[PDB]
Amino acid sequence: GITGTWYNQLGSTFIVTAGADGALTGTYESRYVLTGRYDSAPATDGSGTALGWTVAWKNNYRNAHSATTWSGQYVGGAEARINTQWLLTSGTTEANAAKSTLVGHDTFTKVKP
Amino acid sequence: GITGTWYNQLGSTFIVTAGADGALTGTYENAESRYVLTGRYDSAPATDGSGTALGWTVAWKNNYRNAHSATTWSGQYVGGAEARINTQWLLTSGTTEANAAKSTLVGHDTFTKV
Amino acid sequence: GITGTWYNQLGSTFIVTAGADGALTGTYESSRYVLTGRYDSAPATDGSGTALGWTVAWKNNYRNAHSATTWSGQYVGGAEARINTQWLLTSGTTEANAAKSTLVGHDTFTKV
Amino acid sequence: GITGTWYNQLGSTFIVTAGADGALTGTYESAESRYVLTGRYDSAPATDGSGTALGWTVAWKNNYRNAHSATTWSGQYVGGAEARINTQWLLTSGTTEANAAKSTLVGHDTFTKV
Numbered sequence: 001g002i003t004g005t006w007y008n009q010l011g012s013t014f015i016v017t018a019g020a021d022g023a024l025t026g027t028y029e030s031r032y033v034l035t036g037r038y039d040s041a042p043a044t045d046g047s048g049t050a051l052g053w054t055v056a057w058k059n060n061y062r063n064a065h066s067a068t069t070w071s072g073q074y075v076g077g078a079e080a081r082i083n084t085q086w087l088l089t090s091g092t093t094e095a096n097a098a099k100s101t102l103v104g105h106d107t108f109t110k111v112k113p
Numbered sequence: 114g115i116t117g118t119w120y121n122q123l124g125s126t127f128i129v130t131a132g133a134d135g136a137l138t139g140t141y142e143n144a145e146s147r148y149v150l151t152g153r154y155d156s157a158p159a160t161d162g163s164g165t166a167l168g169w170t171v172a173w174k175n176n177y178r179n180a181h182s183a184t185t186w187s188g189q190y191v192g193g194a195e196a197r198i199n200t201q202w203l204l205t206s207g208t209t210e211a212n213a214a215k216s217t218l219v220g221h222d223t224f225t226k227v
Numbered sequence: 228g229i230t231g232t233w234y235n236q237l238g239s240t241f242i243v244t245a246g247a248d249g250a251l252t253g254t255y256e257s258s259r260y261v262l263t264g265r266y267d268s269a270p271a272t273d274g275s276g277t278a279l280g281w282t283v284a285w286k287n288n289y290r291n292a293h294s295a296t297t298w299s300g301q302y303v304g305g306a307e308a309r310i311n312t313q314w315l316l317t318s319g320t321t322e323a324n325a326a327k328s329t330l331v332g333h334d335t336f337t338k339v
Numbered sequence: 340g341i342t343g344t345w346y347n348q349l350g351s352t353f354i355v356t357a358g359a360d361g362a363l364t365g366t367y368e369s370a371e372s373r374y375v376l377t378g379r380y381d382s383a384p385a386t387d388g389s390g391t392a393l394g395w396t397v398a399w400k401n402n403y404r405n406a407h408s409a410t411t412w413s414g415q416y417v418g419g420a421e422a423r424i425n426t427q428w429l430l431t432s433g434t435t436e437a438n439a440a441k442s443t444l445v446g447h448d449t450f451t452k453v
Contacts, residue, residue: 022174037150050182054151056166068168262379
């Protein structure tokens with residue numbers, strides 16, 4: 001269900017595998033390594049499936065000295081989607097610590113818009 | 114400086130290993146209160162005295178418990194004598210669509226080596 | 228521009244008057260609660276949006292959730308005028324539960 | 340106890356008046372650094388030991404400067420020996436739509452009367 005190729009509202013691509021253990025492994029598209037966890041035994045009451053992951057924005061080509069974490073839930077069904085909020089923290093100095101973290105929201109869908 | 118055991122002020126413990134690939138792996142803590150964590154950190158941070166960006170996720174299920182929720186911490190490691198990890202976190206609970214708007218708590222945590 | 232009636236997608240209604248002095252005052256029909264806030268009364272005219280924020284404390288003469296929501300965002304004019312926000316909802320808790328006191332979310336308002 | 344002069348950890352000062360029907364009015368000083376604030380609070384809180392829920396907004400325009408941004412603080416007042424206001428805040432900047440995704444900062448502030 002979660003396993004697959006996902007797209008956010010800005011055309012970013014999220015390729016993930018949901019492991020049996022609760023593990024999330026994949027790539028965020030340059031391309032970056034992602035890792036996280038998900039609820040591998042969600043409720044049956046129609047509630048969504050809790051999950052999150054992290055990308056540290058360093059690959060072989062660039063380093064932005066930052067990391068984004070996504071926290072959200074997968075809702076399966078006809079138009080499967082993953083609704084997240086995210087926090088993007090940059091490495092800063094102490095004087096600048098106050099403005100190190102951005103907050104936003106992303107919706108992922110299995111159809112590219 | 115990241116590898117090891119870190120403590121928050123509410124007693125919570127987190128043991129991490131920071132691999133050279135930028136991977137973070139460990140547990141967040143009695144067995145029934147132990148959970149798996151995984152994340153990423155910047156393995157080649159600036160040297161201007163900036164901190165080291167990182168993040169990690171814990172889903173609150175283990176073999177004994179399932180809270181149908183996941184927390185992600187976004188923050189930075191600041192080394193020195195009072196080495197610290199300053200984070201902001203998001204806690205999302207699985208909800209019906211009806212109540213999703215109230216699905217996500219936000220907060221902050223500071224972790225120390227003691 | 229900002230002054231007028233605004234709707235989100237989950238059936239809530241906010242009526243707001245944007246004052247010359249940078250004040251935002253009005254009503255949020257969730258029943259009805261007083262709102263108050265501030266906006267940039269001299270934005271850039273380069274296409275950027277107008278920063279603004281407002282607060283609703285969830286008490287009126289009929290009820291009280293012992294909570295307050297604050298909305299932070301920007302107005303965007305044009306054919307498809309919108310106010311895009313992120314919000315924080317904080318409830319009164321004991322300090323034992325103060326770490327789970329605040330929810331975060333997002334809301335888009337249109338002139339509908 | 341909300342009414343009076345408060346300080347955050349970083350040096351800024353916030354002067355509030357708590358009104359009888361839930362209004363917050365006052366000034367935030369980070370004269371050229373002085374800004375109007377406005378907000379609301381729970382004027383009839385819980386008598387169970389819970390704090391008092393509140394929020395306020397500052398738009399970063401005064402007679403001398405304009406940042407084209409606004410901060411909202413959401414939190415609660417905890418009266419006591421060390422009476423305090425614990426908040427989380429969102430700072431949004433006016434951006435073009437292409438930059439709209441990086442328009443909002445999140446952080447937290449604690450205020451005391453000392």
